């Protein structure tokens, strides 16, 4: 049998704190998922954890993206198959200051008309997209895995659009979303970093993200983390 675990948020405008509880469960799921990809478990654990520590934010926004694309025509974020946060909560600052960047991602999957195969190829690519500026201890295997994934995105597209000009346009347009996910991450993380350290915000974090965020803040906000792009502007 198939199916191994499950996770949802338990709130709407209060996703301002429950997003972290969810992000915790989703990054953990992302670890299990990442390990399930052949060769991931052969990466040094310190780097396996570094990548989820830096990539969890793009994986979360992208996961919301797919569900939003299919369930609300990318107008609303879908935190779990069973939770969609509607407009009356979506535009509140406690929500929207972070969620507007997650909505950008949903909007693009919809504008782009991404297939599920293409989507999964991109989610898989985001997994290895944010690394320390100084590299990874077992980086050579990470690099082989990441390049395998980009080739897979190309294949998902070529066999679906047809013709030649549409293969490169769908590929580069989807790739531009993977690259712009870093602009999404810069702002989404700054929300988390600020609410993690500033007690004035009253934001609770799970142990998983709390460890990630204390380790991620001194490196991300200072430019010690490299954004890996798959395409040029």
């Amino acid at each position: 049998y198939a199916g191994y675990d499950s996770s949802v948020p338990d709130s709407t405008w209060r996703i301002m704190t429950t997003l972290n509880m969810l992000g915790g469960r989703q990054v953990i799921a992302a670890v299990k998922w990442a390990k399930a990809i052949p060769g991931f478990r052969n990466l040094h654990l310190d780097d396996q954890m570094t990548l989820l520590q830096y990539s969890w934010m793009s994986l979360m926004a992208f996961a919301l993206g797919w569900r939003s694309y299919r369930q609300s025509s990318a107008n609303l974020l879908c935190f779990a198959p069973d939770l969609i946060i509607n407009e009356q909560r979506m535009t509140l600052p406690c929500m929207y200051d972070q969620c507007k960047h997650m909505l950008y991602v949903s909007s693009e999957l919809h504008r782009l008309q991404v297939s599920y195969e293409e989507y999964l190829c991109m989610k898989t690519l985001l997994l290895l997209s944010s690394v320390p500026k100084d590299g990874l201890k077992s980086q050579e295997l990470f690099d082989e895995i990441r390049m395998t994934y980009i080739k897979e995105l190309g294949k998902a597209i070529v066999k679906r659009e047809g013709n030649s000009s549409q293969n490169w346009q769908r590929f580069y347009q989807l790739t531009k979303l993977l690259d712009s996910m870093h602009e999404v991450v810069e702002n989404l993380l700054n929300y988390c970093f600020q609410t993690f350290l500033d007690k004035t915000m009253s934001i609770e974090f799970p142990e998983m993200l709390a460890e990630i965020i204390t380790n991620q803040i001194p490196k991300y906000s200072n430019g010690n983390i490299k954004k890996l792009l798959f395409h040029q502007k």
């Binding site: 049998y1 675990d5 499950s6 996770s7 069973d82 599920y116």
Partner: protein, 496 residues
């Protein structure tokens, strides 16, 4: 190799060679042919099995059966034509009889039994191919000598036999269909990789699937034979409903279930729709181990009371079908064992339900505190009639039936599972006499020992009713034993 040739208007010559860089030609001094060529092969001793009458017949029948000129074998002579008939799939579908398809099938699959049904069609235009798709009368058997031979659809290209194992030709969920596909556009430069990357193969595959579904629909129209089919292949439909996101609609139409109003018949989701009540926007279903467990389940007591039909899903795979069958003909599917279930209730009754929630708000809070570490919440039920309570699965969790499958698998795997347990809710039947008695006691004293003991006993009993295991069966039994010793006292024509 010896080659004897006589061109029309030339002399007959005999060519002889051992390869190795050289050959010679001599005038043939033997008997002349009227015309033509004959090739005499001088065989390696270990290869003399190829002179066997049996082996020749098998080779010609498998690889040269589509050759236009008659090929005959001379043995002792007894002269036997081998490519006696045209390949059945190249013959006109309207002329071919059932007996002919039957014998073909038996030979194709080495199945002593006749085929259930066959689809025979061809296409042309930007894509050209012909195909025969057969449905067996029995599901494939577990013997490894059979399983190792799949995917058993023969592929021919330009009538040239390519292979017996045609991976990527048909989706796995349909890999019970036996057959022949003969393509004209697909290149003869065949390797598994070329085929995997071939847009031609991709198109052929989606077309074969559509045709398989058409055959299934035709079978669906025949109630007696569909049932035979379904009994053997319902799991394949179900695998497909889960995986095939494009043909999911056509596949849902092929599903058959027992329902609370079907007696012993299996009916379609469309038949369910034709028996829905006004303003019913949902299709109600329950899952379980047996028909009777679900039929007598606490979860359907009110649904029967209101005259609503409930679908009984009792095969393990059903737990997956329900994950993708979100809607059928626009109606939403809901599980009667899950959180948030609502009925096509009257407004007067809804007000009474709200009055009951208020009446029992205090009880819900007390029970939750007793059970805070056991359940997520305690609420007043809109499902129950005669049971004082039940355990409801959260919307995102696993039902008791899926958890017992996961646990059974963990035992099968000699492991335990690092997964989130299904979240559960307890529901209270506000009209039950036990529950009303409890409300009164619970309010009189929140920590009365008899309140604490009754609530736990009801909780454990409710877990059993919902199919969840107990985390501690000995303690449960002991509560029962206490209850027992106290009970014993020992301690017309259509109009438009």
């Amino acid at each position: 190799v010896t080659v004897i040739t006589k061109h029309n208007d030339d002399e007959q010559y005999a060519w002889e060679s051992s390869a190795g860089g050289s050959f010679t030609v001599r005038t043939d001094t033997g008997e002349p042919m009227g015309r033509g060529t004959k090739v005499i092969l001088h065989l390696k001793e270990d290869q003399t099995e190829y002179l066997e009458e049996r082996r020749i017949k098998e080779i010609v029948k498998k690889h040269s059966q589509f050759i236009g000129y008659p090929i005959t074998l001379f043995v002792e002579i007894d002269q036997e034509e081998l490519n006696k008939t045209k390949p059945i799939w190249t013959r006109n579908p309207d002329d071919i009889t059932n007996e002919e398809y039957g014998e073909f099938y038996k030979s194709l699959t080495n199945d002593w039994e006749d085929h259930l049904a066959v689809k025979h069609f061809s296409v042309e235009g930007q894509l050209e191919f012909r195909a025969l798709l057969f449905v067996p009368r029995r599901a494939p058997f577990d013997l490894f000598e059979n399983r190792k031979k799949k995917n058993n659809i023969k592929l021919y290209v330009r009538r040239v036999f390519i292979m017996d194992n045609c991976e990527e030709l048909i989706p796995e969920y349909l890999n019970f269909i036996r057959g022949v596909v003969d393509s004209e556009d697909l290149p003869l430069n065949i390797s598994r990789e070329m085929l995997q990357q071939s847009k031609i193969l991709k198109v052929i595959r989606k077309n074969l699937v559509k045709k398989c579904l058409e055959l299934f629909t035709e079978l669906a129209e025949d109630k007696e034979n569909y049932k035979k089919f379904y009994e053997q292949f319902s799991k394949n439909i179900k695998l497909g409903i889960h995986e095939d996101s494009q043909n999911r609609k056509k596949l849902s139409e092929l599903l058959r279930y027992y329902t609370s109003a079907s007696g012993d018949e299996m009916v379609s989701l469309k038949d369910y729709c034709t028996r829905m009540k006004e303003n019913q926007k949902h299709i109600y279903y329950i899952t379980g181990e047996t028909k009777d467990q679900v039929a007598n389940s606490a979860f359907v007591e009110r649904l029967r009371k209101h005259g609503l039909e409930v679908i009984y899903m009792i095969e393990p795979i059903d737990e997956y079908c329900v994950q993708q069958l979100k809607e059928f003909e626009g109606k939403t599917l809901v599980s009667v064992t899950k959180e948030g279930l609502e009925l096509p209730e009257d407004e007067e009754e809804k007000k009474k339900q709200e009055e009951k929630k208020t009446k029992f708000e205090n009880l819900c809070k007390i029970m939750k505190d007793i059970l805070e570490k056991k359940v997520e919440k305690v609420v007043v039920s809109n499902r129950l009639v005669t049971s004082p309570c039940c355990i409801v699965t959260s919307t995102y969790g696993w039902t008791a039936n899926m958890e017992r499958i996961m646990k059974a698998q963990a035992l099968r795997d000699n492991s335990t599972m690092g997964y989130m347990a299904a979240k559960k809710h307890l529901e209270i039947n506000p009209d039950h006499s036990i529950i009303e008695t409890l409300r009164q006691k619970a309010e009189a004293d929140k920590n009365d020992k008899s309140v604490k003991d009754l609530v736990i006993l009801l909780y454990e009993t409710a877990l059993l009713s919902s199919g969840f295991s107990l985390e501690d069966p000995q303690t449960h039994a002991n509560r029962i034993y206490r209850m027992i010793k106290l009970g014993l006292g020992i301690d017309m024509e259509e109009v438009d």
